[model samples]
Target: GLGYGSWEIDPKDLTFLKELGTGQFGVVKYGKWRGQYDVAIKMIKEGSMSEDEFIEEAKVMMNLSHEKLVQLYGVCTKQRPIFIITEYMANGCLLNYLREMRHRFQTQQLLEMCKDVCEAMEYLESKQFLHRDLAARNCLVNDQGVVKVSDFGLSRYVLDDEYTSSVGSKFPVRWSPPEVLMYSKFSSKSDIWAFGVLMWEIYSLGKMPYERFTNSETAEHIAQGLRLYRPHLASEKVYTIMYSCWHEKADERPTFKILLSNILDVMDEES
Candidate 1:
């Protein structure tokens, strides 16, 4: 039996069908729980993480509830092979979907997707959670054309809205802000910087940012005040917002709330 506010599933009730992907923590399997709910079950091998660390991660998932954020249904953590069950995104990663079906979407649809992600980030900001990692690949889309921000492996809740990474931390280079890449500092503003790169991915149909440059070279380029050019398919207004997000001074970047409003304004004009 489940306890109050607890969603614990029996291991016997879970079924793994196929391997989805692997991450720093464990492997994600596409499967069903209780023989009904389609879910992505992330299995972490025993001894891989301390109990307190596992609980912290789970708590973050449980606390977050938004249409534009992936839903965490339950967990199976009392035994070996802990399971973290979440809503399965049939469309897989947003980046791959965009790359394969770029022609199927219009500018309005792309802008709407950006707005959806911005709204999710706004919610995270309100909750004082720093998404440390924000990118196209970190977002998932469903068959219903809904996009949800996923992957909280590096996320943290901070009272001050800023966190500095421990020494020797790894991050997604292309999607990070200058402060993060250079000083290991993270904040909602840093997330806005990554959001700029995400917009580049959407407008470029999932092209890798700073394509042709090495990570070190990309960092150098960024430090020198260079930003990605506007995608040929993107409108001037959309590109302008993306450009503003790359401001060297993190304080100059617009808040997710502002970004959301700007995107909606563009969306309304296009409609």
Candidate 2:
């Protein structure tokens, strides 16, 4: 019954470490699960939603498990509020790593990372799940350099048959595509667009996107059909593949399968 609702986790059952990050609905803490493996426990506020919404999101995320995707360990909701436990990424997120070490990753290293992310995306797409917000900040990497897509299904509330702004209201201008900016519609192609931005983020070693402009200005620019240009070091082949994803016409964007092919092609050649 303890893992069923918002019941407090037994102090003897967990060894609390430190705060990880906060989402709109909860604060995540790092802790030892069963006195063994590291885990992240998201403590959510009570009565935050009707039963249906909570169950819907929880079911969607719980059923989605892949090596490349963050692993959900369990859930506790018997108490007034609910919490979700998931695997911990000690090295933190991709954006944090880039900010701490501001150097372009070696091409091979970047390719390996890309391959991992593509694998995650491929898995999600196969299940008809679109990660509406695919950005460096949403990706977790361990010290060993293994990548896992985190904050999975956070986009659910923002997704209609198309899209809507999240209740959090913090628009990720750097990662969002033109359609998302204009019409607030997101689909698999929008995810690909964000993936293209993530490719640039990795290549640039965590340089802030659109440093010359503010978020609102960047959003306006995107609405006006502006997109970040490919870096000079990006090879013709890589550029071609990236452009295919970054195309303004979202329908023209390649599926995750095609993206995976191009990613592996470049990776195999460079490796």
Candidate 3:
């Protein structure tokens, strides 16, 4: 129906299709909203601690729209079992998509992946938003092989709250910078760090970052300025670009604007 043209989607207009998967917040379902809009629905189960906070954050989150970022249509927060309706991407996330595919990758295509993430990141940075978590897993890939950024600040929607521990925060350890490792700080620069790892993932074709090290060990090495080695599939030119984001100081890392241009130049150069 395109009813609100996208704000305050009516709950009755949503019809569940299939269960996509269960996640930290609740179940993700394939659904049709207002009959015409095919969408992915995340039904955030009712809870006490974060209902208000999540809704408040959703206000800001929905307004953020970009072709390079996943689009959230609106939320059905009228009652318990609220639904988070969003654009549907058939190909799922980059992390899993890269793994099970036949591995038909090209140098230019890989760089295009970086460009997609950087474009969305640049927009978020311009809005003064911090994506605290950024990785290949956090980004979605469409049927056209287009990579679009996702999971920007969606952690609060998690019901279990498992990532709150200092020791276990090490799962994100491999993607963190020294400042984030030491003080748990987050900024676009820290995002730059994760983006570097994501770039490596593109080059590595979905192998876990720091594959040889334990999460705890990776945290230690990250603090010591240990950088991921050049992925074999990457040229020195591409490797050098992603490596620049690993600088110890936040200021030394390139801003998303600069990173986007830098990566784009290489893509153009290779042309």
Candidate 4:
């Protein structure tokens, strides 16, 4: 049961306006609740898992409150299809948004966006949370140009700041670190590795990492010391920071705290 301050909105009060996208777990739609507030409603079929799993996910989301993280408004779980209402982000996924608007953005603006995400990850790191999936597609941008990290399906709280997945789990190959690809081991450091690829995405204006290579080939290439080349628009300093993230040794990668400071230093120099 939802505690006080956490709402249980009625499905009758929700109206879907348009399809936003679909995922393995649910369909997201642009909608309004109570005929007033704009929201993104993720409709997931009940029994998709045990009720406890759904409730657990809701509890985790409700407990997380941060400006750079998507805010959950409430849920409708009493019926066949459960509805998760969250604050609407008009500009949609960061990958798509960057693809369309990269031409208009200065390096300073892009760096600011990267800093926002790093700040969010720093918060998660402080909280001992692992965002197993960290990529541009999992982040959203608002009309005000603020980027917020979204999608918590693979997130988990950890005591040692590390998690090793059970066998047969899947991950985004190109954006993953060697440890993750080879051992399914995850830690804040591995996330930093993915953040490096995300920087590639942003600087390349949404180009897919290792675009011409298959997943297997990409993994081999990475193991052989291959890394994405510097984006045409990226400054040497920025690319150097990104390169530092892909160090073969996890301990060699900078933590989010240090990464954020490095980005801030760059911003200061450019301004």
Model 2 score (lDDT) = 0.74
Using TM-score as the measure, what is the rank order of every candidate, best first?
3, 1, 4, 2
Candidate 3 structure quality by residue, lDDT tens digits, 67-166: 9999988887767787788888888878888787586888788889889999999999999987877888888888788899886887554545446444
Query: What TM-score would candidate 1 get against the native?
Result: 0.89
Q: How do the residues 123-224 of candidate 4 rate in per-residue lDDT, one tens digit apiece? A: 888888777778898899998989988865434422122222322233478888888888877888888998889888888889999999987888999988
Name the runs in model 3 displaced over 4 angstroms: 1-6, 47-49, 156-159, 169-171
Ten contiguous residues with the weakest lDDT in model 2: 159-168
Candidate 3's TM-score: 0.93
Better of 2 and 4 by lDDT: 4
Among residues 3 or more apart in sequence or in different chains, the pairs in candidate 2 whose N, CA or C atoms overlap within 3 Å are 4-77, 4-78, 5-77, 5-78, 5-79, 6-77, 6-78, 6-79, 7-79
The 10 consecutive residues of candidate 3 with the worst lDDT sum are 161-170
lDDT score, residue 237, model 1?
92
The lDDT values for all models are 0.81, 0.74, 0.82, 0.80
User: In model 2, which runs have C-alpha deviations exceeding 4 angstroms?
Assistant: 1-12, 45-52, 102-104, 157-169
Which regions of candidate 4 fall more than 4 Å away from where they truly are? Answer: 1-7, 45-51, 101-103, 153-170
Per-residue CA lDDT of model 1 for 103-129, tens digit only, reads: 588888889889889999999888887
Q: List the residue pairs that clash in candidate 3.
A: none
Model 1, runs deviating above 4 Å: 2-7, 45-51, 153-170
TM-scores, one per candidate: 0.89, 0.85, 0.93, 0.88
Best by TM-score: 3
